[PDB]
Amino acid sequence: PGNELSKKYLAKVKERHELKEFNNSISAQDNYAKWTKNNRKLDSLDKEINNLKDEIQSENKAFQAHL
Amino acid sequence: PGNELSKKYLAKVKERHELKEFNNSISAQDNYAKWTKNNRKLDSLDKEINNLKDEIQSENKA
Amino acid sequence: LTVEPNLHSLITSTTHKWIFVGGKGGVGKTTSSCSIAIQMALSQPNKQFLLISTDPAHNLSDAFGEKFGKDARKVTGMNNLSCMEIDPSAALKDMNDLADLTGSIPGIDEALSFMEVMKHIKRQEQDEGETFDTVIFDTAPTGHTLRFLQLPNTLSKLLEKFGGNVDISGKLNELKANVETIRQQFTDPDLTTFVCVCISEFLSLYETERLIQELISYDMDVNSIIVNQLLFAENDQEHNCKRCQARWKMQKKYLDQIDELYEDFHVVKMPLCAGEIRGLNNLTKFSQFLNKEYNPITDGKVIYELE
Amino acid sequence: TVEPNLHSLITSTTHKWIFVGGKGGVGKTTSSCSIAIQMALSQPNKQFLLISTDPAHNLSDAFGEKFGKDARKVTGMNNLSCMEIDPSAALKDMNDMGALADLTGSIPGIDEALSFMEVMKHIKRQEQDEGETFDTVIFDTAPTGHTLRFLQLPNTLSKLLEKFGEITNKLGPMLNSFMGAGNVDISGKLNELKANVETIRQQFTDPDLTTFVCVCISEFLSLYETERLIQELISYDMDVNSIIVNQLLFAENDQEHNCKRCQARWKMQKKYLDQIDELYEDFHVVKMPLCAGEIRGLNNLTKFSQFLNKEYNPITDGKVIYELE
Ligand SMILES: Nc1ncnc2c1ncn2[C@@H]1O[C@H](COP(=O)(O)OP(=O)(O)O)[C@@H](O)[C@H]1O
Numbered sequence: 026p027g028n029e030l031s032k033k034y035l036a037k038v039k040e041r042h043e044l045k046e047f048n049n050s051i052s053a054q055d056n057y058a059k060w061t062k063n064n065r066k067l068d069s070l071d072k073e074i075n076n077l078k079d080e081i082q083s084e085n086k087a088f089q090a091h092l
Numbered sequence: 093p094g095n096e097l098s099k100k101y102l103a104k105v106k107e108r109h110e111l112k113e114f115n116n117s118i119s120a121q122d123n124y125a126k127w128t129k130n131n132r133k134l135d136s137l138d139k140e141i142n143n144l145k146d147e148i149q150s151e152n153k154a
Numbered sequence: 155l156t157v158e159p160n161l162h163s164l165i166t167s168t169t170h171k172w173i174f175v176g177g178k179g180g181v182g183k184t185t186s187s188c189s190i191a192i193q194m195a196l197s198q199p200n201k202q203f204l205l206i207s208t209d210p211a212h213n214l215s216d217a218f219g220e221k222f223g224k225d226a227r228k229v230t231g232m233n234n235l236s237c238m239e240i241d242p243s244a245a246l247k248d249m250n251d252l253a254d255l256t257g258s259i260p261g262i263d264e265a266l267s268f269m270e271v272m273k274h275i276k277r278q279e280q281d282e283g284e285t286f287d288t289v290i291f292d293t294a295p296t297g298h299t300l301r302f303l304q305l306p307n308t309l310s311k312l313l314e315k316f317g318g319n320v321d322i323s324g325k326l327n328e329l330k331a332n333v334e335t336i337r338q339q340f341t342d343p344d345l346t347t348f349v350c351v352c353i354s355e356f357l358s359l360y361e362t363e364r365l366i367q368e369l370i371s372y373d374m375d376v377n378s379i380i381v382n383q384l385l386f387a388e389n390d391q392e393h394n395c396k397r398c399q400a401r402w403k404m405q406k407k408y409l410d411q412i413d414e415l416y417e418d419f420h421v422v423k424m425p426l427c428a429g430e431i432r433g434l435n436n437l438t439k440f441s442q443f444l445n446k447e448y449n450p451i452t453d454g455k456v457i458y459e460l461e
Numbered sequence: 462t463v464e465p466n467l468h469s470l471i472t473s474t475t476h477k478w479i480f481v482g483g484k485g486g487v488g489k490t491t492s493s494c495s496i497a498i499q500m501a502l503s504q505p506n507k508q509f510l511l512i513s514t515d516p517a518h519n520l521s522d523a524f525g526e527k528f529g530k531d532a533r534k535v536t537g538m539n540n541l542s543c544m545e546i547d548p549s550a551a552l553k554d555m556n557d558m559g560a561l562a563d564l565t566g567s568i569p570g571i572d573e574a575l576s577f578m579e580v581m582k583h584i585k586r587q588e589q590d591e592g593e594t595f596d597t598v599i600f601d602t603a604p605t606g607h608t609l610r611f612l613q614l615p616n617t618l619s620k621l622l623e624k625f626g627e628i629t630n631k632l633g634p635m636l637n638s639f640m641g642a643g644n645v646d647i648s649g650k651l652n653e654l655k656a657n658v659e660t661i662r663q664q665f666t667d668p669d670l671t672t673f674v675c676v677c678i679s680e681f682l683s684l685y686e687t688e689r690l691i692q693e694l695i696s697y698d699m700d701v702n703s704i705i706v707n708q709l710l711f712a713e714n715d716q717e718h719n720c721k722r723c724q725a726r727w728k729m730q731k732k733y734l735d736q737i738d739e740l741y742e743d744f745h746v747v748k749m750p751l752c753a754g755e756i757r758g759l760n761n762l763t764k765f766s767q768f769l770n771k772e773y774n775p776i777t778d779g780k781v782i783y784e785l786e
């Protein structure tokens with residue numbers, strides 16, 4: 026709520042944004058290897074950050090649906 | 093009278109569904125030409141059908 | 155404890171019943187489709203096989219040099235391999251002459267078109283009274299032909315929170331079953347698997363990495379990639395064309411990368427033969443390199459008997 | 462009507478910004494250099510800059526010279542200057558000298574607009590310490606990522622400056638009591654962006670000041686990726702008018718040609734060329750031949766680049782693609 030929807034939605038959205046900047050520093054051609062690895066990762070964080078977006082959203086249609 | 097949000101949301105969603113079935117009948121390889129044309133089209137109908145989805149939704153909001 | 159750089163394990167497998175072959179770009183999907191088929195047929199005489207294609211251009215017919223139609227005929231020269239070419243986009247369009255809730259829900263059209271095929275198959279097994287032990291799918295070139303595997307979960311995500319104005323909600327629960335009894339099957343590593351075909355260049359290694367992801371999501375089994383049209387130029391009788399030997403250099407570079415990227419995968423290297431690979435006599439000769447991996451040194455000749 | 466070459470652009474006097482791009486190993490860099498060299502040779506008066514974002518230092522490889530962050534001039538040219546910089550290995554050095562960080566990954570397009578102006582900066586700086594104004598700059602757009610997506614930032618930042626307010630004016634007693642612990646700064650410093658990147662935008666949207674040239678090989682996965690790109694650019698309202706189809710081996714007629722395989726590919730390429738021509742009738746479709754081995758260093762980049770001006774003729778020019786061995 027404040028320690029989970031904050032410390033998480035940040036650690037991730039921040040790490041992702043830290044990786045995304047690291048991926049744009051290697052040749053997707055000379056390091057296809059790593060490059061594709063990193064992408065696969067960024068594809069997960071993209072989902073588990075789109076989950077904490079609903080977890081932080083189910084906890085609002087809930088505190089108002091229940092007085 | 094259920095005209096614009098019916099006669100439209102259908103004519104389109106129907107025509108699109110009529111094109112999509114026509115596109116899967118030509119070689120995206122031998123007719124790259126047409127194929128890509130048709131796709132471009134299906135990319136518009138995909139938006140103006142996602143607009144009538146808000147025109148028909150913001151109507152139950154206004 | 156590395157993995158075999160070939161499909162021997164699958165052409166030998168007895169458990170599988172469903173095999174999907176796919177790959178965008180002119181990489182060799184059709185050829186590989188036929189090769190995996192022929193290979194499986196020759197290695198298991200007891201079982202009966204079916205190679206089916208959705209493509210409108212009637213490729214299998216071009217590949218073998220025979221006219222295969224909607225009627226499962228047998229390959230002239232084979233004994234348990236039968237090819238079948240049908241168009242589902244046209245058959246599902248006739249008993250529909252509405253689908254409005256189809257274009258509305260992503261995945262229906264597919265699930266519909268697929269079962270339309272399955273139908274045309276069991277029908278053949280009836281009028282012919284001949285049960286097919288394993289079927290190979292020459293997945294369609296464009297479009298996500300088998301995306302319906304998400305239909306179930308998706309359809310749940312729009313029932314508890316959403317709604318003969320209800321006879322629609324009836325024949326729709328009847329569907330989230332036909333597709334789930336299936337997906338249950340396709341999602342079983344022992345009964346069905348997918349084989350990706352790709353050429354060794356960037357735009358293709360990409361498109362296939364994409365595909366492998368699309369399949370992983372559907373919880374389908376992706377374990378083998380066949381890298382087609384490779385040169386291996388250094389292994390020719392002699393250095394002639396320089397523009398060629400320059401390409402090999404690049405392919406080699408990516409092969410190493412593919413090997414590194416998919417260590418748990420069956421990465422199958424196929425050689426680029428001089429000119430078409432059409433008709434059983436060649437499809438066969440070429441197809442054996444899916445079983446015993448091609449060796450550029452020894453097998454160098456066998457890629458020149460092909461027209 | 463529309464000539465199958467870039468003569469009209471290499472001759473143009475109006476343009477100031479030119480973007481060259483294309484995923485896959487199709488020849489983006491080579492084309493980037495070729496369009497540069499060609500423009501430079503055809504307009505001695507004007508001064509040119511070829512800049513690249515790539516970390517692998519390609520332009521350096523292409524010419525066989527070590528170009529750095531310092532705009533040097535091409536050894537053998539007179540108005541072409543190359544510059545290779547890394548805006549990522551500079552962004553981690555801009556701020557690395559909190560809130561101005563946790564709103565970038567949140568809003569799509571910032572990182573780009575930021576990284577780009579970081580470049581523009583490094584350029585005007587050169588024009589200062591060197592006191593030499595560049596009339597036209599050519600961008601070797603980065604291989605991966607949508608480097609110039611920031612063109613949507615404005616219409617996107619408007620949905621926030623009309624939201625961060627539509628919530629500060631729909632909940633008044635609690636917009637006032639809403640002691641914004643953070644000053645108007647966020648809704649004012651990220652308000653000046655929709656400007657500091659709205660002027661630069663009416664630069665890159667002027668059909669006569671900037672244009673994009675797509676490089677592609679003639680195979681399916683590539684004609685696709687570029688059709689995609691052309692759409693991405695059309696959306697940004699940028700100008701896409703020319704595609705250079707590289708690595709064509711006009712095998713239909715060749716010197717010392719008697720190989721079977723090579724003639725099978727040409728057959729396929731030919732097929733798609735006809736389709737490209739049909740698909741983009743209003744476009745400048747430029748056919749470039751596939752030379753035997755690398756095209757490195759000015760003496761060759763030049764020789765090869767002339768086929769962007771006067772279209773390559775497989776018959777007559779057949780030799781000139783072999784002086785490169
Ligand atoms: N390894 C190979 N060596 C030589 N030719 C090949 C090879 N693989 C495929 N081909 C050629 O490609 C053609 C088949 O392409 P195809 O498999 O139908 O592309 P796709 O699978 O995308 O439809 C055949 O005519 C054959 O000559």
Ligand SMILES: Nc1ncnc2c1ncn2[C@@H]1O[C@H](COP(=O)(O)OP(=O)(O)O)[C@@H](O)[C@H]1O
Pocket residue numbers: 483484485486487488489490491492519707708709749750751752753754755756757
């Ligand atoms: N039309 C061509 N003919 C022959 N070789 C080419 C051609 N275009 C590019 N090359 C070769 O490819 C290499 C450049 O590839 P490059 O253009 O840098 O790929 P990318 O644009 O994806 O960065 C050069 O070393 C050059 O020899």
